[PDB]
Design a binder for this molecule. Structure first.
Ligand SMILES: O=C(O)c1cc(Br)ccc1N[C@H]1CCC[C@@H](C(=O)O)C1
Ligand SMILES: O=C(O)c1cc(Br)ccc1N[C@H]1CCC[C@@H](C(=O)O)C1
Lengths: 158, 157
């Protein structure tokens, strides 16, 4: 039904989608201003780590400061194969994508990193309140020359 | 309010019920979870230490796989289940937790807990493709496997 309230939900979803698109296409020195897409208290970061705990970057300013490090350590990064999923919540989206680029972490050799990613984006007032990255840390270990632990699944049917 | 749209709404509602039922399947009922899939339906684990998915292809293979899964994760429960519909009536995402004993050949019995994302795509009201995404490091830990620590030298606080 075409009511003011359904219309408002559609408008919000449409706006938020454009910000997801923008986020996912932000490259190069533009990454130094990606933080401006977030609420002042917005959070971003990596939810799949070797320690099992997220690394959460809290606050728009902290995200901007973080961008300096990310641009250093992933100097040519691009997201590819981007699929945006709207949800029943006009303020929540998921993205499935791939990503590739050099990885330049001090203490490791320079390497090439490729992974499969899921990102979660939650909005408030048309800015991102929470972004979260989910990936397979093992592919990052590979890129850094770190030996990947192996699980044997004996008896797993074929 | 158009038949195209009434059809999609119905398909999405039907498919959501199937996602709910999959997520709440426990115990011996797991031996029949494969009945939720198309005959050629695929399920499995998309985040593995090898970097390649472990795909289980076909309804019959998924039922055979259930035997293994019930032995290796004998009391498994999904919890904190959040179901995301999408613009596609035939594609859902689930974010949840899961926990239970892990009992793999050649590793000490453990307690495995993880955070999960599942993707479910549908055809003809049955699951055509289910994919699990988790952090393999938590599964290493549950099996007593040492996990390396990545150092992020510049990383601000
Ligand atoms: O992979 C990490 O070590 C990582 C650590 C924190 Br903490 C946050 C995010 C992380 N993932 C990267 C992957 C490459 C692009 C990059 C970006 O888009 O800023 C983010
Ligand atoms: O974690 C694995 O080793 C794994 C291997 C393949 Br092959 C497929 C799925 C896997 N994940 C489990 C996690 C516990 C519940 C279980 C189930 O719901 O059947 C599936």
């Amino acid at each position: 039904e075409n009511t003011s309230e359904n219309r408002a939900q559609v408008a919000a979803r449409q706006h938020n989608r454009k910000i997801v698109e923008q986020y996912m296409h932000t490259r190069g020195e533009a990454r130094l201003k990606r933080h401006l897409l977030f609420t002042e208290d917005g959070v971003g970061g990596l939810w799949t780590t070797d320690s099992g705990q997220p690394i959460a970057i809290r606050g728009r300013e902290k995200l901007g400061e973080h961008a300096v490090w990310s641009l250093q350590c992933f100097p040519d990064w691009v997201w590819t194969d981007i699929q945006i999923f709207e949800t029943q919540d006009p303020n929540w989206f998921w993205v499935e994508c791939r990503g590739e680029g050099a990885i330049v972490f001090p203490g490791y050799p320079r390497g090439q990193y490729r992974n499969h990613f899921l990102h979660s984006f939650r909005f408030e007032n048309g800015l991102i309140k929470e972004q979260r990255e989910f990936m397979n840390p093992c592919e990052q270990f590979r890129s850094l020359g770190i030996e990947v632990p192996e699980v044997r699944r004996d008896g797993l049917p074929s």
